Design a protein around this ligand. Structure first.
Ligand code: HEM
Length: 381
């Protein structure tokens, strides 16, 4: 049973759903452990409850009958999760993340080089939408000619057709790489082994589709919302980053705490318990609202303000917590750092369009509402 999580807050505007800080403050102050009769869900907003739901799989299972949304990795609890996680993790080593940085830098340099003389840019079409698709295509090892945005657009049934077309495209590339191994994700998934078990070629195609669904639109949203913040939240932050070019990672971590909305994951209660202060029964569904708990003043001082120097920022739960903690988190942080650093090198100052209207430039997405357009005036020094 697909649970329509959109019906819990019932937002009055796309703009509110895009940045629901008023609703987070209401739930944290008045209703932090909230039973929603219409969806038959429990809803938790406080940092210590959200963290417990995400990680304590003995009590809060990822593999229940009801959900908020090809290996089903995200739907497995330990012990069955260990093999799937280990085989996919073979493509996300410390060595690969080190080797990816100069490749991702090249891609960012080319995207920014295309807009370097622009008086005005559109973050979405010029940067946030193409960049994570161009990156994942390079990291997969796709032929240079195919270097792909189309796929994830369509991968959003339209869905049956698109998945069958991706499969026919990639299946012969995996077979080819099995005989012709290179430093790319597909080659690392071919060589992966757990207790003598390996992926089949078909499983590797599915693994790449899971990585596309996990890592493209999420990263696009995170980048667009970071640039949104520089225009609309702390308008002095961009200047601070220009003045000290080592601050990019701190800025990325604060934009993942402050401007990624809405982050929520569901679990199914596995055993009766009152760990969240209320009696729950086996089969109950709990939604953990990570974006809300990222503004819990018990963990984050001055939580409704941008502060890239807040020493707790690295504790945000935008990537989850526990066994399912985002496999892509290092890559996501690297992509956001590299695109921000390339942008800072090109542009001395950015300004919003006085006439930009948010409501007409938001569309429904898996995370709530996403920018369709984000204009800015840019300057060079
Ligand atoms: C800003 C970007 C991203 C965000 C906000 C994000 C968020 C998340 C979250 C919250 C989970 C945990 C789900 C849960 O507990 O139920 C997760 C899992 C995962 N993410 Fe990410 N993600 C991002 C980028 C990426 C990228 C770039 C990749 C890969 C290229 C990726 C691959 C995955 C995978 C494979 C899992 C499943 C791990 C498991 O279930 O063991 N993600 N992501």
């Amino acid at each position: 049973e697909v649970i329509p999580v959109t019906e819990i807050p019932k937002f009055q505007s796309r703009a509110e759903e895009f940045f629901p800080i008023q609703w987070y403050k209401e739930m944290l102050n008045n209703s932090p452990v909230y039973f929603h009769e219409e969806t038959n869900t429990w809803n938790v907003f406080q940092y210590e409850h959200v963290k417990q739901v995400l990680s304590d799989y003995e009590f809060f299972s990822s593999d229940g009958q009801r959900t908020t949304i090809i290996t089903n990795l995200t739907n497995l609890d330990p012990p069955d999760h260990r093999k799937a996680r280990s085989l996919l993790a073979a493509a996300f080593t410390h060595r690969s993340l080190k080797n990816w940085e100069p490749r991702i830098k090249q891609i960012a340099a080319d995207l920014v080089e295309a807009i370097q003389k622009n008086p005005t840019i559109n973050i979405v079409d010029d940067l946030s939408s193409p960049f994570p698709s161009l990156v994942i295509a390079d990291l997969f090892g796709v032929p240079v000619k195919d270097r792909f945005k189309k796929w994830v657009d369509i991968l959003f049934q339209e869905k049956q057709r698109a998945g069958a077309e991706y499969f026919q495209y990639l299946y012969p590339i995996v077979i080819e790489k099995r005989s012709n191994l290179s430093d790319d994700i597909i080659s690392d998934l071919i060589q992966a082994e757990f207790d003598g078990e390996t992926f089949t070629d078909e499983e590797i195609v599915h693994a790449t589709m899971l990585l596309l669904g996990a890592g493209v639109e999420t990263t696009s949203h995170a980048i667009a919302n970071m640039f949104y913040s520089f225009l609309y939240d702390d308008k002095s932050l961009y200047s601070e980053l220009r003045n000290n070019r080592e601050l990019a990672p701190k800025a990325v971590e604060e934009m993942l705490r402050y401007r990624f909305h809405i982050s929520r994951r569901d679990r199914t209660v596995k055993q009766d318990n009152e760990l969240l202060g209320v009696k729950l029964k086996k089969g109950d569904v709990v939604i953990a609202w990570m974006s809300a708990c990222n503004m819990d003043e018990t963990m984050f001082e001055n939580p409704f303000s941008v502060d890239i120097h807040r020493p707790t920022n690295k504790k945000h739960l935008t990537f989850g917590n526990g066994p399912h903690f985002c496999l892509g988190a290092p890559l996501a942080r690297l992509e956001m750092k590299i695109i921000l650093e390339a942008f800072l090198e090109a542009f001395s100052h950015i300004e919003p369009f006085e006439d930009f209207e948010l409501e007409p430039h938001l569309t429904a997405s898996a995370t709530g509402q996403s920018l369709t357009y984000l204009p800015m005036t840019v300057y060079r020094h």
